[PDB]
């Protein structure tokens, strides 16, 4: 089976909706954040809320519900965190994992550049190819769902291949034609 990672900035919304959805379809999936820290917004000429990666979703929830339970349920982050709590203990940060994947999917260009920069600045002697794909998804609950569909549909297609390194270029193109999207693609090595 393919090992897949899905990566946004904070590992709270887009990467976690896609996480949920890929796992519910049977995929081997982990998810990560490329930011320095996790941030979540609140009254928005305010400084948002910040927590180190490795902080539990449960405690973040608890920290916001005791800050203004109504506010954070209206803007749907209590919901979001409740949902995340059930998948895994805490947001994880991509530049500190040592997990290895066949495909890492980023949801925006800044994340895509942080991932590719990060792996280039490594290097070992596995020489094993990992494919980094960007599939743009907008950062709100609604588009996180829609983006999870599009991501799952693409993985589902790549998971048919028994020779992914030689098929992938061509699958990317069919998919781009059929969903009318641009998929950035890098090949990196572990």
Is 10 a binder of ligand VO4 (CB under 6 A)? yes
Rg (CA), the chain: 17
Yes or no: say if 108 and 8 are a contact pair by the CB < 8 Å rule. Answer: yes
Report the site for ligand VO4 in 127-156 (rule: CB under 6 A).
139
d(CA 121, CA 105): 19
Binding of residue 114 to ligand VO4 (CB under 6 A): no
The span of 6-14, 46-54, 69-77, 161-169 binding ligand VO4 (CB under 6 A) equals 6-14
Paired with 39 in beta bridges are 50
Q: Is 15 in the site for ligand VO4 (CB under 6 A)?
A: yes
Applying the rule CB under 6 A, the residues between 24 and 53 that interact with ligand VO4 are 33
3-state secondary structure 24-68: HCCCEEEEEECCCCEEECCCCCCCCEEECECECHHHHHHHHHHHH
CB of 155 to ligand VO4, least distance (A): 18
CB of 112 to ligand VO4, least distance (A): 12
Instruction: By CB under 6 A, name the binding residues for ligand VO4.
Output: 8-15, 33, 139
């Amino acid at each position: 089976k393919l090992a897949v990672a899905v990566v946004c900035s904070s590992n709270m919304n887009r990467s976690m909706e896609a996480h949920n959805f890929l796992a519910k379809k049977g995929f081997n999936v982990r998810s990560y954040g490329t930011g320095e820290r996790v941030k979540l917004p609140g009254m928005a000429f305010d400084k948002p809320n910040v927590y180190e990666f490795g902080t539990k979703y449960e405690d973040i929830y608890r920290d916001l519900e005791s800050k203004d339970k109504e506010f954070y349920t209206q803007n749907g982050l209590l919901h979001m965190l409740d949902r995340n709590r059930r998948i895994k203990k805490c947001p994880e940060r991509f530049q500190d994992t040592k997990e290895q994947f066949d495909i890492i999917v980023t949801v925006e260009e800044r994340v895509y550049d942080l991932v590719v920069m990060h792996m280039e600045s490594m290097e070992s002697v596995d020489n094993r190819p990992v494919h980094v794909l960007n599939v743009d998804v907008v950062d709100n609950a609604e588009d996180a769902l829609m983006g999870a569909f599009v991501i799952t549909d693409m993985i589902n297609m790549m998971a048919k291949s028994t020779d992914l390194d030689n098929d992938i270029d061509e699958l990317i193109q069919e998919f781009e034609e059929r969903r009318k999207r641009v998929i950035l693609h890098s090949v990196l090595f572990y």
